[PDB]
């Protein structure tokens, strides 16, 4: 058993490393997913401003008219 053991021991010791880094990896990939989610939310803030630009367009037409009238 001491011989088969060598294989069992090396695999758990490395399997543990899968976990040693997966613990770092999940935190990293979760970060990426999360940041992509944040980027939307901040893009939406910019989209609020996009609508403001259309409000400005109407304001501009009103001024063209009131300034002329």
């Amino acid at each position: 058993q001491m011989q088969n053991r060598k294989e069992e021991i090396q695999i758990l010791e490395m399997e543990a490393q899968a976990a040693a880094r997966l613990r770092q990896v999940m935190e990293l990939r979760e970060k990426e997913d999360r940041q992509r989610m944040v980027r939307m939310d901040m893009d939406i803030h910019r989209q609020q401003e996009e609508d403001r630009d259309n409000a400005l367009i109407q304001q501009w037409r009103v001024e063209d008219t009131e300034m002329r009238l």
Binding site: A19, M26, E30, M37, M40, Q47, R61
Partner: protein, 56 residues
Amino acid sequence: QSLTDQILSVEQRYKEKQENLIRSEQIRREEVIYNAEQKLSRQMKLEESIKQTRLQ
């Protein structure tokens, strides 16, 4: 303890779905209500009818 740690990893992959599940509502609801707000652009079309009326 290995299971506790395996469990914490397993629990976190469920949270991963929670992010997607939340987006499945947060995106969708804001998007439809601000599709409704795009009809204010239709009501910008309104001005062409008005300007044309002014011209005619």
